[PDB]
Design a protein around this nucleic acid. Structure first.
Ligand SMILES: [Mg+2]
Ligand SMILES: [Mg+2]
Lengths: 162, 162
DNA sequence: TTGACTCTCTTAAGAGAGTCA
DNA sequence: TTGACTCTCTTAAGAGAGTCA
């Protein structure tokens, strides 16, 4: 809403409803050939999602709260960071999944950063494979790997140099 | 074009006009504290761009050729890969800048892979900092680093556990 | 046959707000 | 008030295609 007290109330209510989302254990790559275990608080696949939660897209949800007869709305993963600066270096802060599990709402698996930083965690070698992220990754990153390139730098003639 | 011989003549002509683009020397991070040198063949900022070259967006260009009275057109950076498969693992092949310089049309700084592999290259540690791409990176990757996270994992209660 | 413009679209990470009941 | 839906937009990596002289 408006005050710091009102936000803390919004964050506390969010944490409590999310605290009751089913908890799925996931074993993930940490990098360096190591394995770790995370506990995700996953919002349901269908309705009902939990007091104050509604689905706005296939893997998009919003958290609603009517404070002083006036309704407020947030992206479902944003609420933990409501008292944090909303932009960084002129870029919008974004809810980043250290676990890369979209349905998950566990704030211990979420960080607040630029979309670029958010995206980049997808290719990181992970907490045990070289991760240099100030706010450390919880796991490797689904996209990390050799890649599957169809063709590298070619050339027919002799006009270019590296 | 249309026959493999005609696609080759189109690749040859594109190389020749791109070959005459201003060759800009860039000193870049390779990772592991190293500095390397990349030579970029940059398409002009405004018109004219070079025979067969037209701009369709801020940083988007196309190459055009009329073969047997029929006009043919391709994305600026796609021409080198015209005789290679256009998809991989059910994913479209895209022009990936190993130099991360969009205006550059030097084909020795380009690969043909999925949008994900393409994007992922922005965060790599570089050819001397740990790069594991089968088709190796020429530089570190503009986005690599500790990041700038505003807020990491947080909770106010005890509803959660990593 | 060409050049220089015009346009909308794709992907995945993410967001905003409106309609009913 | 609270729930369950509906819709389009943002951002960078990238695309195809139309007009006109
Ligand atoms: Mg993410
Ligand atoms: Mg690229």
């Amino acid at each position: 809403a408006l005050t710091n007290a009102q936000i803390l109330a919004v964050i506390d209510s969010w944490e409590e409803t999310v605290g009751q989302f089913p908890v799925i254990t996931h074993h993930v790559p940490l990098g360096g050939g190591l394995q770790g275990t995370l506990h995700c608080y996953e919002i349901p696949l269908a309705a009902p999602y939990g007091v104050g939660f509604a689905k706005n897209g296939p893997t998009r949800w919003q958290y609603k709260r009517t404070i002083n007869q006036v309704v407020h709305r947030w992206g479902s993963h944003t609420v933990p960071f409501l008292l944090e600066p909303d932009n960084i270096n002129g870029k919008t802060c974004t809810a980043s999944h250290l676990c890369h599990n979209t349905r998950c709402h566990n704030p211990l698996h979420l960080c607040w950063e630029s979309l670029d930083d958010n995206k980049g965690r997808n290719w990181c070698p992970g907490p045990n494979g070289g991760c240099v992220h100030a706010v450390v990754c919880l796991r490797q990153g689904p996209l990390y790997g050799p890649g599957a390139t169809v063709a590298g730098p070619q050339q027919r003639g002799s006009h270019f140099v590296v």
